[PDB]
Design a protein around this ligand. Structure first.
Ligand SMILES: CO[C@H]1C[C@@H]2CC[C@@H](C)[C@@](O)(O2)C(=O)C(=O)N2CCCC[C@H]2C(=O)O[C@H]([C@H](C)C[C@@H]2CC[C@@H](O)[C@H](OC)C2)CC(=O)[C@H](C)/C=C(\C)[C@@H](O)[C@@H](OC)C(=O)[C@H](C)C[C@H](C)/C=C/C=C/C=C/1C
Length: 107
């Protein structure tokens, strides 16, 4: 559902716990295509809490398997992203998404 390829290793010890707030930087693009979003450009990190169904499955599960300081390429299949519906006006149906994610801190 989500493939994680390391860009920079984390500490390999400190992983997100259930219900924790993850602070990340991300850039999102359609597979081999258009970049639709980046938190790095506006220089403001993205925050979300696990176990609250706040983000797409592939993003949550991608971040959950990362340790603090890790940067990774997340390749997310449509079923773990926006599926057959897509995301209105931005993500088409059946889109494989690629996210560059860095886990900055846990809070
Ligand atoms: C302007 O920038 C947007 C994010 C944009 C939207 C459009 C997409 C292309 C994108 O560019 O992000 C994007 O790159 C993307 O696909 N993302 C964002 C990064 C994490 C992964 C993914 C995602 O899941 O987006 C999310 C996706 C679009 C929708 C969710 C997908 C999972 C599903 O379970 C949810 O249904 C419940 C809906 C958007 C978010 O990450 C934000 C944080 C979360 C929500 C909006 C909902 O979870 C909401 O439910 C009411 C909440 O619980 C929140 C916390 C309550 C408060 C008031 C809302 C804050 C809204 C913040 C919105 C932000 C920063």
């Amino acid at each position: 559902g989500v493939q994680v390829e390391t860009i920079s290793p984390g500490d390999g010890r400190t992983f997100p716990k259930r219900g924790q707030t993850c602070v990340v930087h991300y850039t999102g693009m359609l597979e081999d295509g258009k970049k639709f979003d980046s938190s790095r450009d506006r220089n403001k990190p993205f925050k979300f809490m696990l176990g609250k169904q706040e983000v797409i499955r592939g993003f949550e599960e991608g971040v959950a398997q990362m340790s603090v300081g890790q940067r990774a390429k997340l390749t997310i299949s449509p079923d773990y992203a926006y599926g057959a519906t897509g995301h209105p006006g931005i993500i088409p149906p059946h889109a494989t998404l690629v996210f560059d994610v860095e886990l900055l801190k846990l809070e």
